């Protein structure tokens, strides 16, 4: 089938989904990697490619492409929860706690192809790509991202 057809089918009816619902939804996309290929974008504003392909008043779906040894900022997602499924490659997700105006590294783990990473509310994190290949992921945020807070390291 086709990605937007799949997205309307799976995500279009969700109302106040949990991070659990979002993860479950992402795993329901058949051939997510194949389907997402025409939406993968190269870095423009960011160190990583980022393409927002769907949005209603509940959620927002974004295609992310982190090149080798690139990373995001250390950030939270405002008032939003987030889930991400790795389409291709492997990312390291690092977790932080607020040490005041700043943030200290608290946890880190890998997410491999087909696996999901979760971002509960207020969660501070950074995705990076320590590997020699790109990493492509499919992200969902709910509500759609408004104000991202970026933190400075310890
Ligand atoms: Fe994030």
């Amino acid at each position: 089938m086709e990605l937007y057809e799949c997205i309307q089918d799976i995500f279009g009816g969700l109302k106040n989904p949990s991070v659990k619902d979002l993860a479950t939804s992402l795993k329901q996309i058949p051939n997510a990697a194949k389907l997402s290929q025409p939406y993968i974008k190269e870095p423009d504003q960011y160190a990583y490619g980022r393409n927002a392909i769907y949005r209603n008043n509940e959620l927002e779906i974004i295609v992310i492409n982190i090149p080798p040894n690139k990373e995001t900022t250390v950030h939270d997602h405002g008032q939003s929860i987030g889930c991400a499924m790795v389409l291709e490659g492997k990312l390291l997700n690092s977790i932080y706690r607020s040490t005041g105006e700043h943030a200290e590294l608290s946890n880190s783990y890998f997410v491999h192809e087909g696996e999901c990473l979760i971002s509960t509310k207020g969660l501070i994190h950074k995705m990076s790509n320590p590997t020699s290949e790109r990493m492509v992921s499919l992200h969902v945020y709910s509500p759609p991202l408004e104000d991202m807070t970026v933190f400075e390291e310890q």
Side-chain angles (χ1 to χ4, degrees), residues 1-7 9-96 100 102-103 105-120 122-145 147-151 153:
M1 218 176 180
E2 189 278 316
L3 185 55
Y4 279 102
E5 278 179 317
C6 283
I7 287 177
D9 254 23
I10 302 168
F11 291 87
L14 299 185
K15 169 80 154 180
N16 301 312
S18 68
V19 282
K20 192 165 70 285
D21 300 317
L22 297 183
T24 281
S25 299
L26 290 159
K27 302 209 198 77
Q28 293 182 357
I29 312 184
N31 282 124
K34 188 179 203 284
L35 257 39
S36 293
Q37 204 76 18
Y39 303 106
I40 295 171
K41 273 191 179 269
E42 315 272 54
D44 199 331
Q45 312 82 355
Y46 300 93
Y48 57 95
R50 180 191 208 271
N51 192 38
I53 64 176
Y54 181 77
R55 177 228 185 80
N56 54 29
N57 70 323
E58 300 292 316
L59 59 88
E60 192 187 35
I61 296 170
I62 306 180
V63 181
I64 281 192
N65 172 25
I66 311 190
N69 304 117
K70 295 316 182 175
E71 60 185 18
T72 66
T73 69
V74 177
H75 63 274
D76 65 25
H77 306 117
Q79 295 311 299
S80 302
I81 60 182
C83 191
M85 182 176 66
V86 169
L87 301 178
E88 174 183 314
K90 183 212 298 181
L91 67 80
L92 182 74
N93 194 43
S94 303
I95 315 284
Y96 301 81
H102 299 50
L105 174 70
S106 121
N107 208 12
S108 71
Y109 51 88
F110 297 100
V111 186
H112 305 222
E113 293 179 5
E115 299 178 352
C116 284
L117 75 82
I118 295 271
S119 275
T120 40
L123 201 287
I124 313 182
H125 84 140
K126 170 184 86 175
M127 313 195 324
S128 61
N129 180 359
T131 91
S132 63
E133 319 291 337
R134 65 177 195 183
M135 183 290 304
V136 177
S137 47
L138 195 59
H139 297 224
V140 186
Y141 307 96
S142 168
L145 288 184
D147 306 310
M148 267 198 285
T149 308
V150 174
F151 298 80
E153 305 238 13

